[PDB]
């Protein structure tokens, strides 16, 4: 069974931010226009018995002082009066400024993604769903006491923490254009949560990590060799990104044998994203790199959490996430999900113009990374006393 996080209030909150606007409504209404909703189990966002219970849940990762500053930021932004000099200093000390500004629903908006991803982790734990999708989540940059790249609360870390605390090993796969720094850092010292981020990295490109350090860092203490990274040069197409990631994913699965897989599916790798870095598509016959990776992960038959993330071309993010959703139903249930290449009529139909089609409107260094990663995987397996066939893994690359 495939679950999807949705709710009336959830949709209102996920649509309340200045950066992501109505993106979540476009994604959910396109999935609905394509008649996918009757094939999915609605997973309600988690709600708490009291403010103390909510604080206990969020503070499993975030500091109380940061959560307090985030809630104060919402309160201050619900008042006409400008912030005092003292409050400006307090907010800057948590990086609650710049690409992480305040807005009237900043706390409710941030908390909603945590509510959705924690409920999605619970549905996997109780075996109600084999896979759960949360297009309102995937806020990979948020740190313990710091907002970063429009991520205020780290719903991923919190969902993984719920999964690990459920012998349990979690594999985290981050497909976003940006390095999954917040998640990687949270589990830097933990061998039980293996993190893998594929992303662009170049001088001055956000956040600056997931690449050669001035050496390639990969975790510390008992978590040494547990944080995997594949930085890629700009312009990579569906096929080359699929071949660069494919052997890594299969190798991680074979060696780690994860109990759960958590996938961040940021849509900013799309050729049509305004970042204009990678040339990935949502094409499903070249085959979308996203659809290739998700199909591979799903073939493992491991309980999986699929989350959103980046994606600044709202109708193109909806086009991709609708295809990921339909593919998830197909792979899990074995039921063919035929999707018309024409966008069906609905509320947001006008946003898919002027052509109104489902396909997005688009027409060696890796070998050295593969050898380095294989060696890191062997090192991780030896440190963690894991049994694996080296020849079976080496042959994958």
Ligand X SMILES: O=C(CCCCCCC(=O)Nc1ccccc1)NO
Q: Which residues bind K ion (CB under 5 A)?
A: 174, 176, 180, 187, 190, 193, 197, 199, 223, 226
Q: Find the helix or strand (DSSP H, E) in which 74 lies.
A: helix 64-77
Binding mask 89-108 for ligand X (x = CB under 6 A): ----------x---------
Q: Binds 281, which of K ion, Zn ion, ligand X, none (CB < 5 to 8 A, cut-off by type)?
A: none
Q: Which residues contact 141 (CB under 8 A, 6 or more apart)?
A: 148, 149, 150, 151, 154, 178, 180, 181, 182, 207
Among 66, 150, 241, 314, binds ligand X (CB under 6 A): 150
Looking at the chain, after which residues does the C atom sit over 2.5 Å from the next written N, breaking the chain?
Answer: 166, 214, 285, 363
User: Could you say whether residue 309 binds ligand X (CB under 6 A)?
Assistant: yes
> In whole angstroms, what is the distance from residue 172 CA to residue 195 CA?
5
> In whole angstroms, what is the distance from residue 181 CA to residue 191 CA?
17
Q: Specify burial of residue 79 (Cβ count, 10 A radius: 0-12, 13-18, 19+).
A: exposed
> In whole angstroms, what is the distance from residue 61 CA to residue 50 CA?
19
CA 75 to each of CA 53, 56, 104, 151, 241: distance values in angstroms, whole numbers, following the listed order: 20, 21, 7, 19, 44
Q: What are phi and psi of 72, to 5 degrees?
A: -65, -40
Instruction: Tell whether residue 176 is among the known ligand binding residues.
Output: yes
Segment lying near Zn ion (by CB under 5 A), choices 29-37, 258-266, 289-297, 339-347: 258-266
User: Could you say whether residue 235 binds ligand X (CB under 6 A)?
Assistant: no
Selecting among 62, 140, 141, 370, the annotated active-site residue is 141
The pair of structure tokens assigned to 285 is 């016959």
Binding mask 48-87 for ligand X (x = CB under 6 A): ----------------------------------------
User: Could you say whether residue 109 binds ligand X (CB under 6 A)?
Assistant: no
CB of 333 to ligand X, least distance (A): 30
Binding mask 296-315 for Zn ion (x = CB under 5 A): --------------x-----
179 in catalytic set? no
User: Could you say whether residue 316 binds Zn ion (CB under 5 A)?
Assistant: no
Q: Which residues contact 78 (CB under 8 A, 6 or more apart)?
A: 104
The pair of structure tokens assigned to 254 is 């074979």
Instruction: Tell whether residue 250 is among the known ligand binding residues.
Output: no
CB of 12 to ligand X, least distance (A): 22
> In whole angstroms, what is the distance from residue 171 CA to residue 227 CA?
10
Which strand ranges, in their side-by-side order, compose the sheet holding 2-5?
Answer: 41-43, 2-5, 131-134, 304-307, 260-264, 170-174, 193-200, 227-232
Q: How many residues bind ligand X (CB under 6 A)?
A: 14
Q: Binds 250, which of ligand X, K ion, Zn ion, none (CB < 5 to 8 A, cut-off by type)?
A: none
Q: Binds 312, which of ligand X, K ion, Zn ion, none (CB < 5 to 8 A, cut-off by type)?
A: ligand X
Q: Binds 197, which of ligand X, Zn ion, K ion, none (CB < 5 to 8 A, cut-off by type)?
A: K ion
Closest residue to ligand X, judged by C-beta, is 310
Q: Which residues contact 341 (CB under 8 A, 6 or more apart)?
A: 357, 358, 359
User: Could you say whether residue 316 binds ligand X (CB under 6 A)?
Assistant: no
Among 268, 273, 316, 331, binds Zn ion (CB under 5 A): 268
Please, which residue, 281 or 317, has the CB nearer to Zn ion?
317
Which residue has 């930021």 as its token pair? 73
Please, which residue, 206 or 397, has the CB nearer to K ion?
206
Among 136, 266, 289, 308, binds ligand X (CB under 6 A): 266
Catalytic residues, by residue number, are: 141
Footprint of Zn ion on this chain (CB under 5 A)?
176-178, 266, 268, 310
Footprint of ligand X on this chain (CB under 6 A)?
99, 141, 149-150, 176, 178, 206, 266, 268, 274-275, 309-310, 312
């Amino acid at each position: 069974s495939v679950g999807i996080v949705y709710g009336d209030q959830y949709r209102q909150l996920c649509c309340s931010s200045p950066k992501f606007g109505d993106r979540y409504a476009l994604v959910m209404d396109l999935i609905n226009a394509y008649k996918l909703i009757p094939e999915l189990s609605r997973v309600p966002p988690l709600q708490w018995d009291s403010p103390s219970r909510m604080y206990e849940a969020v503070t499993a990762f975030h500091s109380t002082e940061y959560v307090d500053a985030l809630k104060k930021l919402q309160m201050l932004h619900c008042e006409e009066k400008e912030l005092t000099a003292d409050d400006e200093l307090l907010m800057d000390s948590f990086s609650l400024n710049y690409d992480c500004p305040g807005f009237p629903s900043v706390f409710d908006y941030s908390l909603a993604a945590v509510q959705g991803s924690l409920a999605a982790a619970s549905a996997l734990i109780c075996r109600h769903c084999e896979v759960v999708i949360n297009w309102g989540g995937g806020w990979h940059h948020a740190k313990r006491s710091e907002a970063s790249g429009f991520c205020y609360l780290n719903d991923i870390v919190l969902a993984i923490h719920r999964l690990v605390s459920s012998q349990t090993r979690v594999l985290y796969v981050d497909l976003d254009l940006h390095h999954g720094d917040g998640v990687e850092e949270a589990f830097w010292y933990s061998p039980r949560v293996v993190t893998f981020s594929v992303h662009h990295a170049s001088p001055g490109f956000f956040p600056g990590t997931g690449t050669w350090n001035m050496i390639f860092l990969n975790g510390a203490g008992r978590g040494r060799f547990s944080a995997f990274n594949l930085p890629l040069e700009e312009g990579i197409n569906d096929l080359d990104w699929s071949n660069a990631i494919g052997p890594i994913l299969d190798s991680l699965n074979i060696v780690i044998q994860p109990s759960y897989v958590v996938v961040q599916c940021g849509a900013d790798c799309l050729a049509t994203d305004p970042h204009r870095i990678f040339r990935l598509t949502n094409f499903y016959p070249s085959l979308s790199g996203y659809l290739y990776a998700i199909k591979k992960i799903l073939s493992w038959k491991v309980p999986t959490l699929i989350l959103g993330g980046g994606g600044y071309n709202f109708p193109d993010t909806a086009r991709l996430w609708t295809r990921v959703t339909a593919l998830t139903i197909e792979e899990v249930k074995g039921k063919k999900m035929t999707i018309s290449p024409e966008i069906p009529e609905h509320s947001y139909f006008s946003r898919y113009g002027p052509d109104f089609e489902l396909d997005i409107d688009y027409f060696d260094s890796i070998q050295k990374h593969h050898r380095r990663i294989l060696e890191q995987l062997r090192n991780y397996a030896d440190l963690n006393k894991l049994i694996y066939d080296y020849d079976q893994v080496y042959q994958l690359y």
